[PDB]
Amino acid sequence: APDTSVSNKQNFSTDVIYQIFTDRFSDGNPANNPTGAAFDGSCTNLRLYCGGDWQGIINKINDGYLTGMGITAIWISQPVENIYSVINYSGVNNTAYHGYWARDFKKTNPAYGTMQDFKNLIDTAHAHNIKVIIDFAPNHTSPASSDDPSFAENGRLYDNGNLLGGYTNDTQNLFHHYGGTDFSTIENGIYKNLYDLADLNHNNSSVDVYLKDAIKMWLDLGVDGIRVDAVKHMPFGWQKSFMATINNYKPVFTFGEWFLGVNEISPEYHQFANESGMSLLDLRFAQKARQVFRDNTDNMYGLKAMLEGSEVDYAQVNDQVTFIDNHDMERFHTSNGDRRKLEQALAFTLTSRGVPAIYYGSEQYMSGGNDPDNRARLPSFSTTTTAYQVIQKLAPLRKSNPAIAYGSTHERWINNDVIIYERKFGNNVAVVAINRNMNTPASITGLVTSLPRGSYNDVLGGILNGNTLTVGAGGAASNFTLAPGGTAVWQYTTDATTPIIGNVGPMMAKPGVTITIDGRGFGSGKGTVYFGTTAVTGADIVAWEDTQIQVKIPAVPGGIYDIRVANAAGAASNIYDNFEVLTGDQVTVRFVINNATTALGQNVFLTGNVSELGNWDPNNAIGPMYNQVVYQYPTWYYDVSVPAGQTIEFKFLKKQGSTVTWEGGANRTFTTPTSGTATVNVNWQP
Ligand SMILES: [Ca+2]
Ligand SMILES: [Ca+2]
């Protein structure tokens, strides 16, 4: 099917995501509304249920509100059954309207709807070529006090109605009991509770297996994407085996949220996007976009430096979900903010690299501070706002113009207030000019683009005061004045004649799994895809057409491979690197090593003989290992994804700067389980 098909669950760069807080969107079925203290139909107490549900979203797809806007993906609240308690937090009453306080990941939250309502949502969405992304929050269940078992539902977890256990009297250790996080270290935020949420223990095999069976059930119901909550608070080794469960079963686009504040740049954030098997919410983009377009705490050079820099730092920049606000920040539009600021930031996001997400109600200029104020019921379903029209005009270019969906980003003109950038993919071009100065026009002289000669009409139809671009020979545009607040989008599309790979999904899977390579110029005739030097042809190429190839990963050793497509005529595409072939199915094993005393700046790491352990390479060793919460120094521990069912050989090592200190003795062997988890408890071999 083409790259733009609704059935492309692996890659979303051609989509525009509309992020819905299900409860705050439309109440299509009043009969499923919570009653009593848990409900507020006026939705003035934004911590209670207002009543919005999956029938309300179905209705808004049906009547054209969402499809009129050009939305092709909706991201909705976590669908699973949540606790029913109204928790009074210091006077304010609070409910699970947000879907985050799970009690059974196998059932639906009935306020949102029944399992049949969810299937109706999936089918209505798909029939209108809308992909459905769900939140999934496998880090915790719900507010719990083991000291007070009567608080809330004591974090209880059920498995399709069957109680597995609660927070008080957790003899099976389904949960962590280390206190709450102060967020001082990543380790601390992983193993201690996030606020008061009963922290699930993923090293418990029945939690591990439950959560993996639960996500498979949602994959079976036809969801197209997953937004994993609190990725910074779950073990990276466990989330990589969770990603492998999805990708080796039914790979769908998965991304997580790892928060970064303004100008905070975290290597681990990038290492997570680059190595987990899921992409991330592009906080770096969101924060700089708000700095340039909203707060004016940075100028167009900051914007340029972020776009330039992130194209390098994210191994797959086309998989990061960009946005200008979401549930976790103040609404972009303020009370005294010019609406043109929102409108440009939305035009910027919709034409930029990545997977754009529009937070519901943006097209209705909702303002509001932080939680819960950024989650009000959206006030109107007016289809004639300028913002609605900006999305309506620009969001279909994601499907129609390969350059916007996959293209590189080239700044062609810039000054403190103006950026003109080019998106280029093969011969497809889009050029976006933005003048954030609402007062002074910009004299653009000397603009060169890759557009062929012609008179390009602004795709926005002048609604953001854009203009026609007259391009002459060699892509030189005739000089023009960009209006105060001017935003214009000019584009040209043709066929790519040469294979160009714009995106591949999933990026991590074992041999035998079909991956989806999207791009242009593949041709209709089946050609070759290379993983490294290994050619895959014939029956192993499940599907070949000009914009999408589905190919089975060849039985190559685990490790990282460059992918390249050769079309039928032997012409080869660009390399799409960093593809991880897994040694096989994954299980998370906790490795614990005692008596590994280290000097300052020296940490314990683990490597071994499979790619998952870095194939004996100190530079790729797993770690730094932890040593504070579950076990304390000199015992170090770490949860690591390793191939299931086999004997791995491994060794621990200490590294301080460029010095690797290996354990002495023979290599350690361990036979991993076929499912579930295991703990390897060993002592440093001198
Ligand atoms: Ca309802
Ligand atoms: Ca946790």
XYZ file of C-alpha atoms and ligand atoms in Angstrom:
688
model
C 0.000 0.000 0.000
C 1.475 3.535 -0.352
C 3.478 5.202 2.401
C 0.509 7.515 3.009
C -1.989 4.720 3.596
C -3.892 4.636 6.894
C -2.650 1.076 7.196
C 0.925 2.254 7.579
C 1.123 1.757 11.323
C 4.927 1.873 11.291
C 5.651 5.445 10.199
C 3.759 8.601 10.826
C 5.810 11.408 9.104
C 3.039 11.782 6.521
C 0.458 12.337 9.312
C -0.765 15.100 11.494
C -1.693 13.913 14.947
C -4.478 15.548 16.839
C -3.866 14.848 20.563
C -7.152 14.408 22.368
C -7.810 14.337 26.141
C -10.835 12.061 25.588
C -12.661 13.454 28.567
C -12.352 17.063 27.390
C -13.272 16.640 23.764
C -16.856 15.563 23.154
C -19.334 13.732 25.311
C -21.087 11.535 22.677
C -22.673 9.216 25.262
C -24.060 10.841 28.437
C -25.147 7.393 29.773
C -21.505 6.457 30.355
C -20.747 9.519 32.371
C -19.326 9.029 35.916
C -21.916 10.148 38.533
C -21.657 11.960 41.831
C -18.441 13.463 43.048
C -16.490 12.056 40.096
C -18.456 14.037 37.480
C -18.808 17.687 36.583
C -20.828 18.253 33.431
C -20.013 21.969 33.499
C -16.324 20.990 33.355
C -15.397 23.926 35.550
C -13.577 21.562 37.995
C -10.963 20.361 35.586
C -9.914 17.464 37.849
C -13.257 15.692 37.600
C -14.771 13.882 34.677
C -16.509 16.260 32.205
C -17.955 13.361 30.255
C -16.096 13.214 26.926
C -15.767 9.777 25.401
C -14.992 7.658 22.360
C -18.491 8.121 20.889
C -17.776 11.937 20.968
C -14.568 11.454 18.902
C -16.414 9.084 16.456
C -18.962 11.830 16.045
C -16.324 14.410 15.389
C -14.678 12.252 12.746
C -18.113 11.579 11.231
C -19.407 15.087 10.960
C -16.187 16.253 9.451
C -14.665 18.313 12.271
C -11.450 16.360 12.378
C -11.282 15.259 8.770
C -12.095 18.866 7.594
C -8.953 19.975 9.362
C -6.778 17.386 7.560
C -5.960 15.391 10.788
C -4.933 11.908 9.870
C -4.053 10.516 13.297
C -5.656 11.066 16.704
C -3.732 10.442 19.948
C -6.208 9.679 22.724
C -6.086 9.109 26.524
C -4.987 5.739 27.891
C -7.999 3.443 27.128
C -7.580 1.002 29.978
C -9.761 0.737 33.024
C -8.808 3.219 35.669
C -9.604 3.493 39.338
C -12.970 4.787 40.266
C -11.932 6.698 43.437
C -12.366 10.445 43.824
C -9.163 11.249 45.647
C -9.247 14.386 47.691
C -5.814 15.942 47.458
C -5.819 18.640 50.082
C -9.243 19.820 49.452
C -9.275 19.349 45.718
C -11.190 16.295 44.519
C -9.463 14.346 41.718
C -10.447 11.541 39.409
C -8.771 9.451 36.681
C -10.277 11.571 33.800
C -6.799 11.607 32.228
C -6.626 7.757 31.965
C -3.285 7.640 33.801
C -4.365 5.736 36.942
C -4.786 2.298 35.612
C -6.240 -0.695 37.419
C -6.763 -3.137 34.537
C -4.796 -2.787 31.298
C -7.012 -5.471 29.723
C -10.319 -3.617 30.057
C -11.617 -0.236 28.986
C -12.293 2.758 31.079
C -16.132 2.684 30.852
C -16.404 6.505 31.009
C -14.686 6.497 27.661
C -16.605 3.508 26.470
C -16.916 -0.211 26.097
C -14.608 -2.511 24.226
C -17.197 -2.278 21.401
C -16.991 1.497 21.529
C -13.222 1.193 21.189
C -13.559 -1.125 18.152
C -16.113 1.324 16.698
C -13.542 4.133 17.269
C -10.817 2.176 15.526
C -13.009 1.328 12.565
C -14.509 4.794 12.166
C -11.057 6.286 12.382
C -9.649 3.870 9.809
C -12.635 4.249 7.486
C -11.827 8.012 7.500
C -8.064 7.326 7.117
C -7.242 8.336 10.629
C -4.684 6.297 12.603
C -5.387 5.882 16.392
C -2.523 6.262 18.858
C -3.209 5.399 22.492
C -1.316 6.422 25.610
C -0.124 3.376 27.551
C 1.331 4.048 30.989
C 3.096 0.811 32.090
C 5.068 2.463 34.880
C 2.445 2.506 37.605
C -1.121 1.697 38.483
C -2.806 4.416 40.632
C -2.510 6.509 43.907
C -1.701 4.105 46.746
C -0.538 4.158 50.334
C 0.608 0.777 51.586
C 0.325 2.311 55.088
C -3.268 3.212 54.436
C -4.827 0.380 52.380
C -8.114 2.277 52.255
C -6.622 5.200 50.304
C -7.957 5.145 46.690
C -7.953 1.505 45.435
C -4.551 0.821 47.054
C -2.820 0.726 43.632
C -4.573 -2.563 42.800
C -3.914 -4.280 39.565
C -6.440 -6.606 38.021
C -5.921 -8.780 34.974
C -9.179 -8.877 33.061
C -11.197 -8.693 36.231
C -8.909 -10.916 38.235
C -7.104 -9.201 41.117
C -3.432 -9.669 40.967
C -2.633 -7.551 43.986
C -2.512 -4.288 45.823
C 0.085 -2.027 47.211
C -0.445 -2.869 50.904
C 0.644 -6.446 51.489
C 2.501 -7.004 48.327
C 4.001 -10.340 49.123
C 4.516 -11.033 45.358
C 6.432 -7.720 44.916
C 4.356 -6.607 41.986
C 5.300 -3.067 43.017
C 8.357 -1.135 44.156
C 8.446 -0.147 47.825
C 11.321 2.244 48.017
C 9.523 5.429 48.847
C 8.797 8.217 46.334
C 11.261 9.776 43.951
C 12.831 13.140 44.613
C 13.915 13.012 40.917
C 17.572 13.563 41.894
C 18.941 10.858 39.598
C 17.537 8.846 36.756
C 17.948 5.676 38.871
C 15.994 7.277 41.674
C 13.191 8.324 39.358
C 13.005 4.772 37.935
C 12.679 2.662 41.070
C 11.009 4.950 43.513
C 7.394 5.999 43.078
C 6.419 8.878 40.885
C 4.551 11.006 43.471
C 2.152 8.459 45.024
C 1.595 6.222 42.102
C 2.081 2.561 42.842
C 5.229 1.837 40.968
C 5.062 -1.362 38.999
C 7.901 -3.789 39.379
C 8.861 -4.887 35.866
C 11.419 -7.366 37.210
C 8.510 -9.319 38.637
C 7.772 -11.867 35.833
C 4.077 -11.763 36.145
C 4.091 -7.878 35.825
C 6.481 -8.156 32.872
C 4.383 -10.747 31.062
C 1.058 -9.051 31.936
C 2.023 -5.723 30.489
C 3.407 -7.367 27.356
C 0.217 -9.398 26.939
C -1.853 -6.267 27.594
C -0.120 -4.207 24.852
C -0.526 -7.122 22.456
C -4.269 -7.088 23.138
C -4.456 -3.368 22.202
C -2.328 -4.119 19.084
C -4.887 -6.785 18.244
C -7.726 -4.340 18.552
C -6.097 -2.369 15.681
C -4.368 0.605 17.368
C -1.769 2.188 15.068
C 0.584 3.807 17.530
C 1.450 3.961 21.191
C 2.594 6.880 23.243
C 4.302 5.412 26.248
C 4.057 7.466 29.355
C 6.995 8.073 31.784
C 9.845 6.518 29.782
C 12.337 8.275 32.038
C 10.874 6.404 34.980
C 11.037 2.825 33.702
C 14.159 0.727 33.191
C 15.634 1.264 29.691
C 16.431 -2.458 29.501
C 12.812 -3.241 30.298
C 11.415 -0.743 27.806
C 13.695 -2.196 25.074
C 12.240 -5.708 25.709
C 8.764 -4.125 25.743
C 9.576 -2.456 22.345
C 10.829 -5.736 21.001
C 7.594 -7.398 22.068
C 5.672 -4.858 19.994
C 7.992 -4.876 16.980
C 8.410 -8.603 16.838
C 4.669 -9.028 17.138
C 2.787 -6.177 15.389
C 5.198 -3.163 15.080
C 3.372 0.120 15.380
C 4.797 3.589 15.797
C 5.753 4.091 19.438
C 7.016 7.241 21.034
C 7.458 8.346 24.608
C 7.657 11.463 26.626
C 11.024 12.307 28.283
C 10.619 15.860 29.509
C 13.301 18.449 28.952
C 12.873 22.045 30.127
C 13.909 25.147 28.144
C 17.449 24.782 26.798
C 18.108 21.615 28.817
C 19.937 19.188 26.566
C 20.254 15.717 27.780
C 22.432 13.024 26.104
C 20.361 10.203 27.640
C 17.256 11.723 26.080
C 18.912 11.417 22.678
C 20.367 7.989 23.526
C 16.850 6.866 24.458
C 15.376 8.156 21.086
C 18.301 6.649 19.273
C 18.406 3.285 21.091
C 15.146 2.313 22.775
C 13.254 1.271 19.708
C 10.720 4.099 20.274
C 10.934 7.741 19.258
C 10.247 10.699 21.521
C 8.125 13.699 21.847
C 10.397 16.339 20.477
C 10.729 18.529 23.497
C 13.735 20.214 22.030
C 11.645 21.356 19.064
C 8.712 22.331 21.295
C 10.731 24.415 23.665
C 12.666 26.310 20.951
C 9.456 26.881 18.918
C 7.879 28.458 22.038
C 10.992 30.459 22.679
C 11.054 31.879 19.123
C 7.359 32.114 18.344
C 5.766 32.595 21.773
C 7.988 33.905 24.482
C 10.505 35.657 22.327
C 13.309 34.425 24.460
C 15.224 33.383 21.361
C 15.368 34.449 17.726
C 15.482 32.738 14.357
C 19.140 31.696 14.712
C 18.133 29.646 17.786
C 15.400 28.082 15.690
C 17.910 27.380 12.888
C 20.482 25.943 15.322
C 17.788 23.588 16.766
C 16.596 22.363 13.377
C 20.177 21.935 12.224
C 21.357 20.345 15.363
C 18.436 17.986 15.807
C 18.788 16.651 12.268
C 22.128 15.189 13.472
C 21.409 14.260 17.079
C 18.263 12.213 16.476
C 19.309 9.188 14.498
C 15.780 9.153 12.979
C 14.607 12.766 13.071
C 11.569 11.860 10.916
C 10.153 9.849 13.837
C 10.140 12.535 16.544
C 6.731 13.963 17.285
C 6.832 17.767 17.278
C 4.307 20.000 18.896
C 4.106 23.506 20.288
C 2.121 22.594 23.450
C 0.562 19.457 24.944
C -0.906 18.267 28.283
C 2.427 18.963 29.948
C 2.844 22.701 29.350
C 0.867 25.909 29.302
C -1.245 26.426 26.187
C 0.818 28.182 23.556
C -1.849 30.790 23.081
C -1.945 33.270 26.026
C -4.681 35.896 26.900
C -2.605 38.813 25.672
C -0.800 36.856 22.925
C -1.391 37.634 19.291
C -3.211 34.784 17.543
C -0.783 35.134 14.658
C 1.865 33.729 16.984
C -0.137 30.513 17.320
C -0.976 30.433 13.663
C 2.692 30.738 12.611
C 3.915 28.198 15.179
C 1.306 25.773 13.835
C 2.341 26.460 10.207
C 5.972 25.959 11.319
C 5.233 22.636 13.073
C 3.042 21.341 10.194
C 5.778 21.977 7.610
C 8.731 20.855 9.764
C 10.402 17.469 9.970
C 8.986 14.887 12.293
C 5.440 13.826 13.063
C 3.363 16.931 13.996
C 0.912 16.744 16.865
C -1.648 19.418 17.411
C -3.003 19.564 20.981
C -6.807 19.553 20.826
C -8.405 22.958 20.938
C -5.329 24.769 19.451
C -7.482 25.553 16.395
C -9.918 27.209 18.818
C -7.203 29.374 20.521
C -7.646 27.847 23.973
C -5.356 29.485 26.508
C -4.700 28.014 29.972
C -1.822 27.496 32.300
C -0.423 24.182 33.393
C -2.280 21.123 34.528
C -5.158 21.027 34.829
C -5.752 24.391 33.180
C -4.332 23.282 29.840
C -6.954 20.481 29.812
C -10.265 22.367 29.563
C -13.126 21.094 27.486
C -12.679 22.543 24.106
C -15.070 25.458 23.749
C -16.204 25.306 20.155
C -16.171 23.111 17.123
C -16.020 26.126 14.789
C -14.492 25.161 11.488
C -13.881 28.712 10.325
C -11.114 29.919 12.677
C -7.899 30.955 10.921
C -6.034 28.342 12.924
C -8.463 25.637 11.695
C -7.874 26.826 8.140
C -4.051 26.913 8.621
C -4.202 23.223 9.615
C -6.735 22.459 6.908
C -4.428 23.899 4.218
C -1.148 22.601 5.489
C -1.833 19.160 7.039
C -2.671 17.459 3.654
C 0.814 18.465 2.331
C 2.192 15.808 4.631
C 0.551 13.194 2.516
C 0.996 14.934 -0.839
C 4.490 16.330 -0.584
C 7.296 13.846 0.215
C 9.520 16.857 0.988
C 7.373 17.865 4.022
C 6.911 14.284 5.186
C 10.589 13.189 4.750
C 12.713 15.992 3.522
C 15.859 17.503 4.789
C 15.616 21.085 6.168
C 17.793 23.790 4.597
C 17.642 27.358 5.809
C 17.628 29.563 2.606
C 17.248 33.026 4.205
C 17.389 34.184 7.868
C 17.659 37.164 10.091
C 16.503 37.683 13.760
C 12.818 37.563 12.835
C 12.526 35.826 9.513
C 13.401 32.338 8.521
C 12.843 30.897 5.047
C 13.564 27.177 4.960
C 13.380 24.515 2.413
C 12.280 20.934 2.783
C 13.680 18.801 0.038
C 13.138 15.202 -0.851
C 14.310 14.106 -4.258
C 12.763 16.743 -6.488
C 10.010 17.582 -4.128
C 10.456 20.908 -2.480
C 8.539 22.991 0.012
C 9.733 26.477 1.080
C 8.279 28.178 4.058
C 8.883 31.781 4.856
C 7.980 33.036 8.307
C 8.237 36.600 9.560
C 7.621 36.531 13.315
C 7.875 40.298 13.539
C 4.279 41.472 13.710
C 5.325 45.056 13.076
C 8.013 45.327 10.439
C 7.973 43.778 6.971
C 11.033 41.948 5.814
C 12.794 42.807 2.580
C 13.842 39.423 1.156
C 16.570 39.739 -1.413
C 18.772 37.015 -2.810
C 16.580 34.076 -1.916
C 17.546 30.939 -3.806
C 15.484 27.796 -3.643
C 15.382 24.458 -5.370
C 12.017 25.297 -6.895
C 11.865 25.092 -10.759
C 10.933 28.399 -12.407
C 7.328 29.484 -11.981
C 4.898 31.527 -10.005
C 4.215 29.563 -6.863
C 1.024 30.483 -5.105
C 1.096 30.441 -1.369
C -0.512 27.141 -0.167
C -1.995 29.167 2.747
C -3.996 31.336 0.217
C -2.607 34.548 1.724
C -4.405 33.913 5.058
C -1.233 34.424 6.940
C -0.313 37.322 4.594
C 1.910 35.164 2.416
C 2.538 36.058 -1.199
C 3.288 34.401 -4.531
C 6.852 33.465 -5.103
C 8.175 34.139 -8.545
C 11.137 31.862 -9.139
C 13.280 32.329 -12.191
C 16.191 30.410 -13.559
C 18.395 28.526 -11.166
C 15.760 28.764 -8.355
C 16.378 32.491 -7.745
C 13.283 34.111 -6.470
C 12.323 37.596 -7.435
C 12.714 39.867 -4.367
C 9.664 40.479 -2.191
C 8.563 42.028 1.061
C 7.372 39.524 3.610
C 4.404 41.153 5.435
C 4.522 41.669 9.275
C 3.540 38.200 10.580
C 3.762 36.804 7.027
C 3.861 33.076 6.573
C 3.831 31.504 3.190
C 4.376 27.992 1.970
C 5.402 27.297 -1.689
C 5.861 23.828 -3.008
C 6.598 21.747 -6.062
C 6.100 17.983 -6.371
C 7.337 15.469 -8.980
C 8.305 11.812 -9.067
C 11.534 10.792 -7.583
C 13.226 8.672 -10.219
C 15.918 7.295 -7.908
C 15.130 5.364 -4.695
C 15.092 7.712 -1.721
C 14.329 6.355 1.729
C 12.495 8.806 3.949
C 11.617 6.512 6.885
C 11.787 2.908 8.070
C 9.668 1.421 10.869
C 10.202 -0.487 13.048
C 13.939 0.284 13.658
C 14.606 -2.704 15.907
C 13.266 -6.219 15.364
C 14.496 -9.753 15.060
C 15.018 -11.677 11.752
C 11.832 -12.562 10.070
C 9.899 -9.438 11.041
C 8.540 -7.294 8.135
C 9.674 -3.671 8.267
C 8.247 -0.806 6.300
C 10.552 1.361 4.209
C 8.833 4.495 2.956
C 10.107 6.999 0.452
C 9.965 7.603 -3.231
C 11.358 6.320 -6.487
C 11.426 2.612 -5.538
C 9.469 1.826 -8.641
C 6.774 -0.682 -9.230
C 9.135 -3.529 -9.986
C 10.584 -5.400 -7.065
C 14.264 -4.592 -6.597
C 16.654 -5.259 -3.684
C 16.946 -4.135 -0.137
C 20.264 -4.379 1.544
C 20.855 -4.805 5.247
C 24.561 -4.047 5.243
C 25.784 -6.041 2.315
C 23.041 -8.652 2.602
C 20.697 -8.519 -0.272
C 17.045 -9.304 0.211
C 15.122 -10.084 -2.876
C 12.233 -12.083 -4.174
C 9.816 -13.701 -1.741
C 11.356 -12.004 1.304
C 10.241 -8.628 -0.041
C 6.723 -8.874 1.069
C 5.546 -5.809 -0.870
C 7.176 -3.365 -3.288
C 5.676 -0.236 -4.811
C 7.036 3.202 -5.447
C 6.505 4.763 -2.014
C 6.689 1.690 0.238
C 8.591 -1.570 0.506
C 7.801 -4.220 3.103
C 10.678 -6.603 3.516
C 11.473 -9.359 6.008
C 14.614 -8.760 8.010
C 17.186 -11.393 6.789
C 18.750 -13.883 9.179
C 21.809 -11.773 9.821
C 23.576 -11.596 13.183
C 22.279 -9.096 15.671
C 23.737 -5.672 15.453
C 23.221 -2.317 13.727
C 22.730 -2.226 9.908
C 22.491 0.375 7.202
C 19.541 -0.181 4.924
C 19.597 0.845 1.229
C 17.118 0.042 -1.500
C 18.211 -0.687 -5.083
C 15.284 -0.367 -7.508
C 14.729 -2.918 -10.265
C 17.203 -1.050 -12.487
C 20.005 -1.417 -9.975
C 19.888 2.287 -8.840
C 20.526 2.620 -5.043
C 18.961 4.966 -2.493
C 20.522 6.850 0.320
C 21.575 4.817 3.359
C 19.089 4.659 6.212
C 21.382 3.714 9.067
C 21.072 2.585 12.725
C 18.701 -0.310 12.060
C 19.051 -2.799 14.923
C 18.633 -6.468 14.103
C 17.939 -8.195 17.468
C 19.474 -11.557 18.267
C 15.904 -12.770 18.845
C 13.075 -12.312 21.251
C 14.033 -10.309 24.272
C 13.668 -10.834 28.037
C 14.837 -8.389 30.676
C 17.404 -9.821 33.040
C 18.476 -7.908 36.149
C 22.324 -8.280 36.537
C 23.532 -7.660 40.076
C 27.247 -7.629 40.920
C 28.546 -7.414 44.433
C 31.884 -6.215 45.609
C 32.555 -3.977 42.658
C 34.193 -1.183 44.480
C 35.079 1.741 42.186
C 37.098 4.896 42.302
C 35.651 8.384 41.641
C 34.389 8.578 38.129
C 34.540 4.811 37.631
C 31.426 2.848 37.028
C 30.551 -0.750 36.420
C 29.286 -1.822 33.035
C 28.428 -5.139 31.496
C 29.231 -6.546 28.051
C 28.976 -9.924 26.507
C 28.786 -11.877 23.439
C 25.528 -10.786 21.781
C 24.788 -7.447 20.163
C 22.417 -6.692 22.985
C 25.405 -6.633 25.270
C 27.674 -4.739 22.860
C 29.473 -7.807 21.461
C 32.341 -7.581 23.915
C 33.066 -3.995 23.120
C 33.779 -1.719 26.169
C 32.501 1.278 24.194
C 29.225 -0.461 23.690
C 29.018 -1.986 27.151
C 25.724 -1.754 29.045
C 25.801 0.792 31.786
C 26.725 2.720 33.904
C 25.004 0.226 36.160
C 23.004 1.441 39.130
C 23.990 1.154 42.802
C 21.668 3.185 45.107
C 17.971 2.139 45.177
C 17.439 -1.618 44.618
C 20.983 -2.523 45.739
C 23.602 -0.208 47.169
C 27.224 0.158 46.352
C 29.406 -1.922 46.110
C 26.575 -3.868 44.634
C 25.566 -2.515 41.319
C 22.486 -3.691 39.379
C 20.896 -3.066 35.963
C 17.942 -4.359 33.962
C 19.102 -5.243 30.450
C 17.296 -6.610 27.439
C 18.996 -9.782 26.196
C 17.946 -12.563 23.790
C 15.557 -14.922 25.342
C 16.215 -18.595 25.646
C 19.956 -18.708 25.176
C 23.210 -18.974 26.934
C 25.007 -15.621 26.782
C 28.569 -15.183 27.874
C 29.433 -11.953 29.593
C 31.761 -10.184 31.935
C 31.544 -6.994 33.933
C 34.073 -4.217 33.667
C 34.739 -0.950 35.330
C 35.389 2.091 33.101
C 36.810 5.402 34.193
C 37.418 7.656 31.229
C 39.486 5.700 28.701
C 40.440 2.838 31.127
C 38.503 -0.398 31.052
C 39.089 -2.792 33.921
C 37.719 -6.258 33.124
C 36.703 -8.831 35.652
C 39.322 -11.550 35.840
C 38.567 -15.238 35.453
C 36.541 -17.062 32.933
C 33.630 -15.481 31.104
C 30.322 -15.866 32.884
C 27.543 -17.837 31.201
C 23.875 -17.513 31.822
C 21.005 -19.209 30.089
C 18.210 -16.613 29.684
C 14.521 -17.473 30.176
C 12.143 -17.725 27.253
C 9.755 -15.185 28.725
C 9.509 -13.297 31.973
C 12.526 -12.001 33.780
C 15.561 -13.340 35.583
C 18.134 -12.038 38.084
C 21.841 -12.813 37.824
C 23.463 -12.186 41.187
C 27.281 -12.526 41.021
C 30.412 -11.221 42.780
C 33.274 -9.323 41.157
C 35.880 -11.832 39.887
C 39.268 -10.100 40.416
Ca -19.756 10.386 28.317
Ca 9.170 3.218 37.736
